[PDB]
Design a protein around this ligand. Structure first.
Ligand SMILES: CCCCCCCCCCCCCCCCCC(=O)OCC(COC(=O)CCCCCCCCCCCCCCCCC)OC(=O)CCCCCCCCCCCCCCCCC
Ligand SMILES: CCCCCCCCCCCCCCCCCC(=O)OCC(COC(=O)CCCCCCCCCCCCCCCCC)OC(=O)CCCCCCCCCCCCCCCCC
Ligand code: HEA
Ligand code: HEA
Ligand SMILES: CCCCC/C=C\C/C=C\C/C=C\C/C=C\CCCC(=O)O[C@H](COC(=O)CCCCCCCCCCCCCCCCC)COP(=O)(O)OCCN
Ligand SMILES: CCCCC/C=C/C/C=C/CCCCCCCC(=O)O[C@H](COC(=O)CCCCCCCCCCCCCCC)COP(=O)(O)OCC[N+](C)(C)C
Ligand SMILES: CCCCCC/C=C/CCCCCCCCCC(=O)O[C@H](COC(=O)CCCCCCCCCCCCCCC)COP(=O)(O)OC[C@@H](O)CO
Ligand SMILES: CCCCCC/C=C\CCCCCCCCCC(=O)O[C@H](COC(=O)CCCCCCCCCCCCCCC)COP(=O)(O)OC[C@@H](O)CO
Ligand SMILES: CCCCCCCCCCO[C@@H]1O[C@H](CO)[C@@H](O[C@H]2O[C@H](CO)[C@@H](O)[C@H](O)[C@H]2O)[C@H](O)[C@H]1O
Ligand SMILES: CCCCCCCCCCO[C@@H]1O[C@H](CO)[C@@H](O[C@H]2O[C@H](CO)[C@@H](O)[C@H](O)[C@H]2O)[C@H](O)[C@H]1O
Ligand SMILES: CCCCCCCCCCO[C@@H]1O[C@H](CO)[C@@H](O[C@H]2O[C@H](CO)[C@@H](O)[C@H](O)[C@H]2O)[C@H](O)[C@H]1O
Ligand SMILES: C[C@H](CCC(=O)O)[C@H]1CC[C@H]2[C@@H]3[C@H](O)C[C@@H]4C[C@H](O)CC[C@]4(C)[C@H]3C[C@H](O)[C@]12C
Ligand SMILES: C[C@H](CCC(=O)O)[C@H]1CC[C@H]2[C@@H]3[C@H](O)C[C@@H]4C[C@H](O)CC[C@]4(C)[C@H]3C[C@H](O)[C@]12C
Ligand code: CUA
Ligand SMILES: [Cu+2]
Ligand SMILES: [Mg+2]
Ligand code: NA
Ligand SMILES: [Zn+2]
Lengths: 43, 514, 49, 84, 73, 105, 227, 49, 144, 58, 46
C-alpha cells in the first residue's frame, strides 16, 4: 500500500509517552486489586 | 447529528464500526478474565478462593470471548463492513433491523456482568449444565441473568443471520452468480445458515432450564422424570455448529489475505473452497455428541459419532492445502497480515489434528474433561479465530479508517503474541495427557511445572494485547493517509477509496451477462 | 449508462470464471478490462433514461 | 431445515451437478464403504421348526415345490431344517 | 570469450516443487521408521518385557512390607 | 495444451504486430511474467522491437529487468539472455540496466 | 499418578489402558507427520523468488488431498473402533461396586453380600502425613481385588460429577437418576489415583478417588472389617 | 538515506536480547519460583513411614 | 510526483516486480528539456547519452527492480523489540511473585519431596516407563 | 370506508426533510418522546436494581 | 450531510492525539479492569 507522510508525526518521545500511558492504564488498576487480594480475603 | 448517526444508524459501515469497537472492548474483558485464570493456576495453592469464584471467572471468560468478542468482530464487524462492498450492494437488506442486532449486545453484556455481581455469580462453565446450574445448587439470580444474556445475544445473531442470508442471496449484481462472489461472502452466508438453525435450539434448551429454575418444570430433573443429559444434547446440538460459526468467517478472511499477499488474483481452487465450507457447515450438525462420550451412551452411538466427526478433516484439509497452493508461485509480500495468516494455517492445523485425536471416543475417555481438550480448542480459537481476526484487522484497518498502521510495530506485535500463545497452550497437551482435569482452581503438585510455564505464556500475550492498543493509538495519532492500494481489480471492497464514502454503490456496478 | 462521469464495471472474462475483474470506467474514450481487454464506454445521462 | 450448507442464490444445472458430485455421490461412497465393512457371514441360528414360519399351504409352482424362489441353502432352512 | 550455454528456462518453479515434495515424502518415511523404533516399538517392548516374568504377589508383598496399604499391614 | 514452440510462437507473433499499441505492450508483458518460465530471447527480442515502434526506451529497459527477476536464484539465465540479445541491443541502442546503473540498490 | 514434568499418559495399569497407549502412539505419529508436512510446505512455498501467478488448475491435485486424508482417517478409525468395541465386550464380573458422587466427596457401596458402604474424602493438606500427596489422598480408599473383573456402577445424589482413574483408562460420568456402568481390571497391586472430572461447584478440585488393589483374601478381610 | 533500522537496528537487537535473557534468567532463578522438576536423578529418596 | 487522495478512481502507478509495466507513467508533466528528450527518444536510441537514457527511465518509472526489491535491516528492529517486550513481561512476573503470590504449600519442602519420592517408589508409581522404571531397586539408586 | 391512501401518500412524500418516524406530524413526536423516556428511564431503573441486587440485604 | 473521510467516520474524535490517548485509555482500560473489580467485589462479600 502507499500512504502520505504523517499529517501529525508522532516522535519517538511521543510514542514512548503513548505506550507508557497505555501500559499503565492496564497494569495499575489490576495491580492495585491484586496487591490487595489478601486484604479482601482476610475480610 | 451524533445521536442520529451512531445510535439510530441504518448504515452498514458505521454499524460495522460499532461492532468492531464493542468486540475490542469485550476482548479486553475476556483477556483480563483469562489472566485471572492463569494467575490462579500460576503456582500451586489457592490465590483467589475456591472453585466457585474461580469458575465464575472461567465461565465469563468463555462467554465473553465467544459471544462478545469473536462473533461481533467477525460477523457484525467484518461482515457488515465488507459483505455489501464485496457484492456492490448499497447496504444490507434490512438496514434498520441490522442496527438492532448491534444494540442488543450491550444489554446482553450488561446482563452477563450483572450475573457475576449478584449472589455468588454463575460458576457453571459456559455449558451451564444442570443440576449444578439449577435452582438448588445455583439458587438466586446469577444463572437466570446468564440465560437472559444468552437470549439477547441469540436474538441478535438470529436476526443478523436473516439479514446476511437475505443480503447475500438477494443483493448481488443481477449478472453475478453465487459462484462469482468472494469466499469471505460465502463464509458469512454459511455461518449465518448455521446460526439460523442452531441458536433456536440453544434458546429452547436454556428456556427449559429457566422454567426448571423458576416455573417448577422438570425437563432436566429426574424427580419429575426429566434427564440432565437431555440438556446436554440440546446445548451441544448448538455448541458444535457454534465452533464452526466461530471459525468459518475466519477461513473466509484467511482466503482473502493469503490470496492478496501472494499477489494472486484469485484463491486456488475456488469451487473446492466453497464445497469445503458447505461440507463443514453440513457435517457440523451431525457430530454434537462427541462432547458426550463419557455420559454413558451406547457403544454403537459412540462409534457413529467418532466416525462422523473425523469426516470433517477431509473438507478442512482441502482448505489448508488450497491455501498452501495459493501461496505457491506467489510474489509473497511479508506484511503483518500475511504473518497472521501464515501463523493461522499452521496453528489451526495443529489444533484441528488434536481435535481428531479427541474424536476417537475410546481415547476421549481418558482425555475428556482434561486440559487436552483445552489445548485443542485454544489452538483453533486463540491461534485460529484470533489470528484470522488480527490478520483481517491489520489488512483492512486502512480501508475502514483511511490511515496506515506502522508495519514494523504490527510485526513486533505478531511476534510477541505468537510466542505468548504457544507458551500458554502447548504445555497444556502434557497436562491433559497426564490427567489434569478441567475447571480446577488448583492441581496435584506433579502438574506444577507446566502450569507455571502456561501462566508465564499468558502474561506474554497480555503484553501483546497492550501493545496492540498502543499501535492503534499510534496510527490515529500520526494520521498517515492511504494513497494507493494494489490489486483493486480483484478486491472490490477497496475500489471506493479509504475510507469509502458513507453511501457507496448508489449507482450499482455494471456487469453484463453476454 | 451512468448518471455521473464514472461507474464501476465488473468483467467476467470467460463464461463461468469465478473471478470478476473490477475497474472504474470514466467518461471519454472506451477503456479496456485489465484482464481480458473487452471494451467498455460510458454513456452518461440524467436519470430521464 | 436441520442440516446446513447454504446456497439458493439462483437454482440451476451447475448447482445440481455440484450437489450430485459434492454431496450425493460422496454419501453413496461413504455408505458403500460402511456396508463393505459390516459384511461377512454371521453365524446362522439353530433351527427351531416354529409353526408360524416356513409356511406350506400349497407347493410352490417351481422346483420341488418346497423351496422359496431365492432360497439360499446357507441361511434358509426347509420346514424340516437346514439342507446338507 | 566463450558463449554461455543455454540453461533451462521453463518450469523452474514446478521443478523445484516436484523435487521437494519428493524429498518431503522420503523424509516422512524416514521419520515414521524412526518413530516406530524409538517410540511405538520401544513401548510395546517395555510392556512385554515388564510383564514377561512379572510376579504380582511378589510386587504386592514388597508394597505391603513398605507400609503403603490400608488393607494390608 | 500447446508445445513450447507453439507458446513461444504465439508470443513472438503478439509482440511483432506492427501497430501494436502501448496498452497491448503492457498487457502482454504483464501477462507473460505470470507464467512459470523466463521468456525465450526470441520473445524478448519481439517485445523490445515493439518498444522501439512505440518510441518507448524506458519500457525496453524494464523488460530486461523483469527477465532477470523471473530467473530468481538461477543467476546463469539473465547473462545468457543478454548475450543472445546483444545484436538487437546494439541495433536498437538499448542499454542494459547494468550499463545504466539501475541494478544498484 | 502423574509425576513431575510428565509429557504423556500415566503408565497403563489395565490391558485396556495399554491398548490406548499403543493407539495413541499410532495416532500421534500421524499428527506429527501431517503437522510437520504442513509446516514444511509452508516454508517451501515461502522460500523462492520464482513466481507463477497465472491461473492454476485444481482438479487433479484435489484427488490427492481428499483421497490421502480419507485413507489416513480410515487407518485411525479402524484401531479406534476395535478398542471401542473391545471395551464394550462381555466379561462377567466377579464383584460389583457402586460409587455415588456428592458435593464434595465420593461414597462407595459394596452390596453383593453384606451392606458395606462408606464415604471417601480428600485428606486436608494440613493433615497429610509426610510423603503423602497433596489434593490426592483420601481417608477411606476404595479397596479392590487385583487381577479380577470388577463392575463399577456410577451415579450421583446431587449434581453431575465424573469418576475417573487415568491409569486404568476410566472416566464415567456420575448423573443423578442414572446408573452408569464401567469395567475395571488391574493387572497389578498398588494405589491408583483419579479426580472428579465434571464441574460440580466450590470443591470440584478437591474430591479425589484412590483405588487400593490387593489380593482377594486381603480384600475379603478388609470388607469384613468395614461392616 | 539510512532509515531507523539502518541507524538503530543493531542496537535494538543487541540490547533487546541481552535484556530479555537477563531478566528471564533472574525471574527463573532468583525469586523463589518453584518449578518442581522431576526428582529422577536429583532427589535422594528418604524414609517416610 | 504528488499522488492525491481525490485520485483513487483513476489509474495509478505501482512498483511491483510482477506488474513490470504499470498503468501510467511515474511522471506525467514534462519540463521544456524533458519534452525535448521525449522528442529525441523518437530518433535512434543510440544517439541518447547514458544520462538521457536514465532520465527517460526515471520519467517512466519510480524505482528500479533492484531498488524495489532491496532487503532491509527491519528484522533487527522487529526481533530486538519483541525480545524487549518479552523481557518486560518477565518484570510483570517478578512483580506478581513478589506482591501477589504467597508461600506455596508445605509439600514442596525438600524433605517432604524426598519422602514423597520414596513413597512413590514404594508404590511403584509408573513402573514400566515413567517413574519407578527409572529407579534401580537392586542398587538402591537412580538408574544411570 | 373510502380509499384515502392518496392523501397519506401526499403527506408522507412532502419535501420537509422529516425522517419517516416523525413525518406524520406532532403526534409522532409525542409517542417518540414517551417511548424513549420509558426506555431510558427504565434502563436507569434497571441499573439501580442491579446495584441493589449486587449486595446482600439481611 | 455527515462528515466523510479519515478521522470523520468514527464515533470518537481523533483531532487531538493526547485527548484520544486519554479516551482510548479509559475505553480499553475500563474493559480490562472490570473483571478485577468484580473479583474484588465478590471477595468483599464473603
Ligand atoms: C507445535 C506448536 C509450536 C511448538 C511450540 C513449542 C515448541 C517447543 C516444543 C515442541 C517442539 C515440537 C515437538 C513436539 C513434541 C515435543 C514433546 C514430546 O516429546 O511429546 C511426546 C508425547 C508423549 O510422550 C511419551 O509418552 C514419551 C515421552 C518421551 C520422553 C523423552 C524426552 C523428550 C524430550 C523432552 C521434551 C521437552 C519439553 C518441551 C516444552 C515446550 C514448552 C513450550 O506428548 C505429546 O503427545 C504432546 C502432544 C502434542 C500434539 C501437537 C503436535 C504438534 C507438533 C508440531 C511439530 C511440527 C514441528 C515443530 C516446529 C516448532 C516451530 C514452529
Ligand atoms: C520462512 C519460513 C516461515 C515458516 C512459517 C510457518 C508458520 C509460522 C507463522 C509465520 C510467521 C512468518 C514470519 C516470517 C519472517 C520472514 C522475514 C522476511 O523475509 O521479511 C521481509 C524482510 C524484507 O524483505 C524484502 O524486502 C523482500 C520480500 C521478502 C523476501 C522474499 C524473498 C524470499 C526468497 C529467498 C529465500 C532463498 C532460499 C532458497 C531455498 C530453495 C532451495 C532450492 O523484512 C525484514 O527485514 C524483517 C521481517 C521480520 C520477521 C520477524 C517475525 C518473526 C515472528 C516469529 C516469532 C519470533 C519471536 C522472536 C523472539 C523470541 C524470544 C524468545
Ligand atoms: C474454532 C473452534 C473449533 C474448531 C474449528 C474445532 C474443530 C474440531 N474439533 Fe473441537 N472444540 C472446540 C472448538 C473447535 N473445535 C471447543 C471450544 C471445544 C470444547 C467445548 C467445551 O467443552 O467447552 C471443542 C471440543 C471438541 C471435542 C470434545 C472433546 C471432549 O470434550 O472430550 C472434540 C471431540 O471430538 C472436538 C473435535 C474437533 C474436530 C475433529 C474438529 C475438526 O473440525 C478439525 C478438522 C481439522 C483438521 C483435521 C486440520 C486440517 C486438516 C488437514 C491438514 C488434512 C489432513 C488431516 C487428517 C488426514 C487428519 N472438539
Ligand atoms: C474465542 C474463545 C477463546 C479465546 C480467544 C480464549 C483465550 C484464552 N484463554 Fe480460554 N477458554 C475459552 C474460549 C477462549 N479462550 C472457552 C470456551 C473455555 C472453556 C470455558 C469452560 O470451561 O466453561 C476457555 C477456558 C480456558 C481455560 C481453562 C480454564 C479451566 O479449565 O479451569 C484457560 C486456562 O488457561 C484459558 C486461558 C486462555 C488464555 C490465557 C487466553 C489468551 O490466549 C487470551 C489472550 C488475548 C487475546 C487472544 C486478545 C483478545 C482479543 C482482543 C483484545 C480483540 C482485539 C479486537 C480487535 C482487533 C477488533 N481459557
Ligand atoms: C429388486 C429385487 C426384487 C425385484 C422384484 C422381484 C419380483 C417382484 C415382482 C412382482 C412382485 C409382485 C408379486 C409379489 C409376489 C412376491 C414377490 C415378492 C418379491 C420377491 O421376489 O420375493 C421373493 C419370493 O418370490 C416369489 O415367491 C415368486 C415371485 C414370482 C411369482 C409372482 C406371481 C404373482 C403375480 C401377481 C401379480 C398381481 C398384479 C396385480 C396388478 C393389479 C393392478 C390394478 C422372496 O424370495 P424368498 O426366497 O421367499 O426369500 C429370500 C430368502 N433368501
Ligand atoms: C498438507 C497438504 C499436502 C498433502 C499432499 C499434497 C501434495 C500436492 C502435490 C502436488 C504436486 C502438483 C505439481 C503441479 C506442478 C506442475 C504444473 C505447473 O506448475 O506448470 C503450470 C501448468 O499449468 C497448467 O496448465 C495446469 C494447472 C496449473 C498447475 C500449477 C498448479 C498446481 C500446483 C499445485 C501446488 C501444490 C502446492 C503444495 C500444496 C500441498 C504451467 O505449465 P504449462 O506447460 O501449461 O505452461 C508452461 C509454458 N510452456 C508450455 C511454454 C513451458
Ligand atoms: C431430517 C432427518 C433425517 C433422519 C436422520 C436420523 C434421525 C433420527 C431421529 C430418531 C429419533 C427417534 C428414535 C427412537 C428410537 C428409540 C430411542 C430412544 O428411546 O432413546 C432415548 C432418547 O430417545 C430419542 O429418540 C430422542 C428423540 C429426538 C432426538 C433428535 C435427534 C436429532 C435432531 C435433529 C433435528 C433437526 C431439525 C428437524 C426439523 C426440520 C434414550 O433412551 P435409551 O436409548 O432407550 O437408553 C436406555 C438404555 O441405555 C438402557 O436400558
Ligand atoms: C427472554 C425474553 C427475551 C425477549 C427478547 C426480545 C428481543 C427483542 C425485542 C424485539 C423488538 C421487535 C421490534 C420490531 C422489529 C421488526 C423487525 C422487522 O420487521 O424487520 C424487517 C426485516 O425482517 C424481516 O422482514 C423478517 C424478520 C421479522 C422479525 C421480527 C422480530 C422478531 C423479534 C424476536 C426474534 C426471535 C424469535 C424467536 C426465534 C427463535 C424490516 O427490516 P428493516 O431493516 O426495519 O426495514 C427494511 C425496510 O426496507 C422496510 O420498509
Ligand atoms: C494480571 C494483570 C496484572 C499485572 C501486574 C501489574 C504489574 C504491576 C502494576 C503495578 O501496580 C501497582 O503496584 C504497586 C506496588 O508495586 C501498588 O502500590 C501498593 O504498594 C505500594 C508499595 O508497597 C504502596 O505505596 C501503595 O500505597 C500500594 O497501593 C499499586 O497499588 C498498584 O497499582
Ligand atoms: C523499564 C525497562 C528498562 C529496560 C532496560 C534496558 C537495558 C539494556 C540492556 C542491554 O544492553 C546491551 O548489551 C550489549 C552487550 O552484549 C551491548 O553491545 C548493547 O549495545 C547493549 O545495548
Ligand atoms: C420512566 C421510567 C420508569 C422508572 C420507574 C421507577 C419506578 C420505581 C418504583 C419503585 O418500586 C419499588 O419496587 C417494588 C414495586 O414497584 C416495591 O417492592 C414491593 O413491590 C411488590 C408489589 O407488587 C411486592 O410484591 C413486594 O413485596 C415488594 O418488594 C417497592 O416498594 C417499590 O418502592
Ligand atoms: C462439481 C463441483 C463444482 C464444479 C464446477 O461447477 O465448477 C466440484 C467443486 C469441488 C469438487 C469436489 C472437491 O474438489 C473435493 C473432492 C475432490 C475429489 O477429487 C472428487 C470428489 C470431490 C468431492 C469433488 C467433486 C466435484 O468435482 C466438486 C464438488
Ligand atoms: C363496511 C365494510 C364494507 C367495506 C367497505 O366498502 O368499506 C364491510 C364489508 C365486509 C364487512 C365485514 C365482513 O362481512 C365480515 C364481518 C361480518 C359480521 O357480521 C360483521 C362484521 C364484519 C367484520 C364485517 C364488518 C363490515 O360491515 C365490513 C368490513
Ligand atoms: Cu465432583 Cu467435580
Ligand atoms: Cu464439537
Ligand atoms: Mg464432562
Ligand atoms: Na490455584
Ligand atoms: Zn475481462
Amino acid at each position: 500500500i502507499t500512504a502520505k507522510p504523517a499529517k501529525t508525526p508522532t516522535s519517538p518521545k511521543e510514542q514512548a509517552i503513548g505506550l507508557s500511558v497505555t501500559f499503565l492504564s492496564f497494569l495499575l488498576p489490576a495491580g492495585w486489586v491484586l496487591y490487595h487480594l489478601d486484604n479482601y480475603k482476610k475480610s | 447529528m451524533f445521536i442520529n448517526r451512531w445510535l439510530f444508524s441504518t448504515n452498514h459501515k458505521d454499524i460495522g464500526t460499532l461492532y468492531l469497537l464493542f468486540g475490542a472492548w469485550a476482548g479486553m474483558v475476556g483477556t483480563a478474565l483469562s489472566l485471572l485464570i492463569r494467575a490462579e493456576l500460576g503456582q500451586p495453592g489457592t490465590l483467589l478462593g475456591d472453585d466457585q469464584i474461580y469458575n465464575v471467572v472461567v465461565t465469563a471468560h468463555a462467554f465473553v470471548m465467544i459471544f462478545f468478542m469473536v462473533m461481533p468482530i467477525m460477523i457484525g464487524g467484518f461482515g457488515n463492513w465488507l459483505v455489501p462492498l464485496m457484492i456492490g450492494a448499497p447496504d444490507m437488506a434490512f438496514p434498520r433491523m441490522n442496527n438492532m442486532s448491534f444494540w442488543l449486545l450491550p444489554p446482553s453484556f450488561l446482563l452477563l456482568l450483572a450475573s457475576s455481581m449478584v449472589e455468588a455469580g454463575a460458576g457453571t462453565g459456559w455449558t451451564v449444565y444442570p443440576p449444578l446450574a439449577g435452582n438448588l445448587a445455583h439458587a438466586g439470580a446469577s444463572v437466570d441473568l446468564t440465560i437472559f444474556s444468552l437470549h439477547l445475544a441469540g436474538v441478535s445473531s438470529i436476526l443478523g443471520a436473516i439479514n446476511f442470508i437475505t443480503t447475500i442471496i438477494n443483493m448481488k449484481p443481477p449478472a453475478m452468480s453465487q459462484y462469482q462472489t468472494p469466499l469471505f461472502v460465502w463464509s458469512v452466508m454459511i455461518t449465518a445458515v448455521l446460526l439460523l438453525l442452531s441458536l433456536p435450539v440453544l434458546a429452547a434448551g436454556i428456556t427449559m432450564l429457566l422454567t426448571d429454575r423458576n416455573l417448577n418444570t422438570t425437563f432436566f430433573d429426574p424427580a419429575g422424570g426429566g434427564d440432565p443429559i437431555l440438556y446436554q444434547h440440546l446445548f451441544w446440538f448448538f455448541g458444535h455448529p457454534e465452533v464452526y460459526i466461530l471459525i468459518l468467517p475466519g477461513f473466509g478472511m484467511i482466503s482473502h489475505i493469503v490470496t492478496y499477499y501472494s499477489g494472486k488474483k484469485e484463491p486456488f481452487g475456488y469451487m473446492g473452497m466453497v464445497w469445503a465450507m458447505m461440507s463443514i457447515g453440513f457435517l457440523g450438525f451431525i457430530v454434537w455428541a462427541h462432547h458426550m462420550f463419557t455420559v454413558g451412551m451406547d457403544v454403537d452411538t459412540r462409534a457413529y459419532f467418532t466416525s462422523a466427526t473425523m469426516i470433517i478433516a477431509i473438507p478442512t484439509g482441502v482448505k489448508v492445502f488450497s491455501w498452501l497452493a495459493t501461496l505457491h508461485g506467489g510474489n509473497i509480500k511479508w506484511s503483518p497480515a500475511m504473518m497472521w495468516a501464515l501463523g493461522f494455517i499452521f496453528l489451526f492445523t495443529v489444533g484441528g489434528l488434536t481435535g481428531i485425536v479427541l474424536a476417537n471416543s475410546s481415547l476421549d475417555i481418558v482425555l475428556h474433561d482434561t486440559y487436552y481438550v483445552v489445548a485443542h480448542f485454544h489452538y483453533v480459537l486463540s491461534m485460529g479465530a484470533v489470528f484470522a481476526i488480527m490478520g483481517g484487522f491489520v489488512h483492512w484497518f486502512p480501508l475502514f479508517s483511511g490511515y496506515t498502521l506502522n508495519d514494523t510495530w504490527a510485526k513486533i506485535h505478531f511476534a510477541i503474541m505468537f510466542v505468548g500463545v504457544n507458551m500458554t497452550f502447548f504445555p497444556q497437551h502434557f497436562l491433559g495427557l497426564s490427567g489434569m482435569p478441567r475447571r480446577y482452581s488448583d492441581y496435584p503438585d506433579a502438574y506444577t511445572m507446566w502450569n507455571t510455564i502456561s501462566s508465564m505464556g499468558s502474561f506474554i500475550s497480555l503484553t501483546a494485547v497492550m501493545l496492540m492498543v498502543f499501535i492503534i493509538w499510534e496510527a490515529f495519532a500520526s494520521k498517515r493517509e492511504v494513497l494507493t492500494v494494489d490489486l483493486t481489480t480483484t478486491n472490490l471492497e477497496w475500489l471506493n477509496g479509504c475510507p469509502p464514502p458513507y453511501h457507496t454503490f448508489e449507482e450499482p456496478t455494471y456487469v453484463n451477462l453476454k | 449508462p451512468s448518471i455521473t462521469n464514472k461507474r464501476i464495471v465488473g468483467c467476467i472474462c470467460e463464461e463461468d470464471n469465478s473471478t470478476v475483474i473490477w475497474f472504474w470506467l470514466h467518461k471519454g474514450e472506451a477503456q479496456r478490462c485489465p484482464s481480458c481487454g473487452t471494451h467498455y464506454k460510458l454513456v452518461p445521462h440524467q436519470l430521464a433514461h | 431445515a436441520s442440516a446446513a450448507k447454504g446456497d439458493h442464490g439462483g437454482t440451476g444445472a451447475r448447482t445440481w451437478r455440484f450437489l450430485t458430485f459434492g454431496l450425493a455421490l460422496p454419501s453413496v461412497a461413504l455408505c458403500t464403504l460402511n456396508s463393505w465393512l459390516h459384511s461377512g457371514h454371521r453365524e446362522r441360528p439353530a433351527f427351531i421348526p416354529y409353526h408360524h414360519l416356513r409356511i406350506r399351504t400349497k407347493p410352490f409352482s417351481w422346483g420341488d415345490g418346497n423351496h422359496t424362489f431365492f432360497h439360499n441353502p446357507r441361511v434358509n432352512p426347509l420346514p424340516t431344517g437346514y439342507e446338507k | 570469450s566463450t558463449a554461455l550455454a543455454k540453461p533451462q528456462m521453463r518450469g523452474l518453479l514446478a521443478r523445484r516443487l516436484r523435487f521437494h515434495i519428493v524429498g518431503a515424502f522420503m523424509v516422512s518415511l524416514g521419520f515414521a521408521t524412526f518413530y516406530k523404533f524409538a517410540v511405538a516399538e520401544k513401548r510395546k517392548k517395555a510392556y512385554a518385557d515388564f510383564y514377561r516374568n512379572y510376579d504380582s504377589m511378589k510386587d504386592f508383598e514388597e508394597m505391603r512390607k513398605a507400609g503403603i496399604f490400608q488393607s494390608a499391614k | 495444451h500447446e508445445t513450447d514452440e507453439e507458446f513461444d510462437a504465439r508470443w513472438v507473433t503478439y509482440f511483432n504486430k506492427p501497430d501494436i499499441d502501448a496498452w497491448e505492450l503492457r498487457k502482454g508483458m504483464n501477462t507473460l511474467v505470470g507464467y512459470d518460465l523466463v521468456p525465450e530471447p526470441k520473445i524478448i527480442d519481439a517485445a523490445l522491437r515493439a518498444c522501439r515502434r512505440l518510441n518507448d526506451f524506458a519500457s525496453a529497459v524494464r523488460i530486461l529487468e523483469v527477465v532477470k527477476d523471473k530467473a530468481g536464484p538461477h543467476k546463469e539465465i539473465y547473462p545468457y539472455v543478454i548475450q543472445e540479445l546483444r545484436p538487437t541491443l546494439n541495433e536498437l541502442g538499448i542499454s542494459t540496466p547494468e550499463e545504466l546503473g539501475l541494478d544498484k540498490v | 499418578m502423574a509425576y513431575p514434568m510428565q509429557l504423556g499418559f500415566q503408565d497403563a495399569t489395565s490391558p485396556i489402558m495399554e491398548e490406548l497407549l499403543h493407539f495413541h502412539d499410532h495416532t500421534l505419529m500421524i499428527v506429527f507427520l501431517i503437522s510437520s508436512l504442513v509446516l514444511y510446505i509452508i516454508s517451501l512455498m515461502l522460500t523462492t523468488k520464482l513466481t507463477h501467478t497465472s491461473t492454476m488448475d485444481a482438479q487433479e491435485v484435489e484427488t490427492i488431498w481428499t483421497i490421502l486424508p480419507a485413507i489416513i482417517l480410515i487407518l485411525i478409525a479402524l484401531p479406534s473402533l476395535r478398542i471401542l468395541y473391545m471395551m464394550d465386550e462381555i466379561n462377567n464380573p466377579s464383584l460389583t461396586v457402586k460409587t455415588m458422587g456428592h458435593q464434595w466427596y465420593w461414597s462407595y457401596e459394596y452390596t453383593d453380600y453384606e451392606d458395606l458402604s462408606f464415604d471417601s474424602y480428600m485428606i486436608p493438606t494440613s493433615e497429610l502425613k509426610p510423603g503423602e500427596l497433596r489434593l490426592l489422598e483420601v481417608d477411606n480408599r476404595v479397596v479392590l481385588p487385583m487381577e479380577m473383573t470388577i463392575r463399577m456402577l456410577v451415579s450421583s445424589e446431587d449434581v453431575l460429577h465424573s469418576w475417573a482413574v487415568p491409569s486404568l483408562g476410566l472416566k464415567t460420568d456420575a448423573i443423578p437418576g442414572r446408573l452408569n456402568q464401567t469395567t475395571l481390571m488391574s493387572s497389578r497391586p498398588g494405589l491408583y489415583y483419579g479426580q472428579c472430572s465434571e464441574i460440580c461447584g466450590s470443591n470440584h478440585s478437591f474430591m479425589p478417588i484412590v483405588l487400593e488393589l490387593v489380593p482377594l483374601k486381603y480384600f475379603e478381610k478388609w470388607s469384613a472389617s468395614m461392616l | 538515506a539510512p532509515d531507523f533500522h539502518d541507524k538503530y537496528g543493531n542496537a535494538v537487537l543487541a540490547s533487546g536480547a541481552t535484556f530479555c535473557v537477563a531478566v528471564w534468567v533472574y525471574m527463573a532463578t532468583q525469586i523463589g519460583i518453584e518449578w518442581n522438576p522431576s526428582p529422577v536423578g536429583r532427589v535422594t529418596p528418604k524414609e517416610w513411614r | 510526483s504528488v499522488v492525491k487522495s481525490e485520485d483513487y478512481a483513476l489509474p495509478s502507478y505501482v512498483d511491483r516486480r510482477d506488474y513490470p509495466l504499470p498503468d501510467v507513467a511515474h511522471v506525467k508533466n514534462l519540463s521544456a528539456s524533458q519534452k525535448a528528450l521525449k522528442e529525441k527518444e523518437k530518433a535512434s536510441w543510440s544517439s541518447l547519452s547514458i544520462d538521457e537514457k536514465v532520465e527517460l527511465y526515471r520519467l517512466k518509472f519510480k524505482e528500479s527492480f533492484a531498488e524495489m526489491n532491496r532487503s532491509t535491516n527491519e528484522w533487527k528492529t522487529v526481533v530486538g523489540a519483541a525480545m524487549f517486550f518479552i523481557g518486560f513481561t518477565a518484570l510483570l512476573l517478578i512483580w506478581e511473585k513478589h506482591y501477589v503470590y504467597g508461600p506455596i504449600p508445605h509439600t514442596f519442602e525438600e524433605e517432604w519431596v524426598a519422602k514423597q519420592t520414596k513413597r512413590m517408589l514404594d508404590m511403584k508409581v509408573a513402573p514400566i516407563q515413567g517413574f519407578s522404571a527409572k529407579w534401580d531397586y537392586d542398587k538402591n539408586e537412580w538408574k544411570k | 370506508f373510502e380509499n384515502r391512501v392518496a392523501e397519506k401518500q401526499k403527506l408522507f412524500q412532502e419535501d420537509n426533510g422529516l425522517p419517516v418516524h416523525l413525518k406524520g406530524g406532532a403526534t409522532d413526536n409525542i409517542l417518540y418522546r414517551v417511548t424513549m423516556t420509558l426506555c431510558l428511564g427504565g434502563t436507569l431503573y434497571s441499573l439501580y436494581c442491579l446495584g441493589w441486587a449486587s449486595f446482600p440485604h439481611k | 450531510h455527515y462528515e466523510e473521510g479519515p478521522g470523520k467516520n468514527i464515533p470518537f474524535s481523533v483531532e487531538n492525539k493526547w485527548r484520544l490517548l486519554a479516551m482510548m485509555t479509559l475505553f480499553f482500560g475500563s474493559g480490562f479492569a472490570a473483571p478485577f473489580f468484580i473479583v474484588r467485589h465478590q471477595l468483599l462479600k464473603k
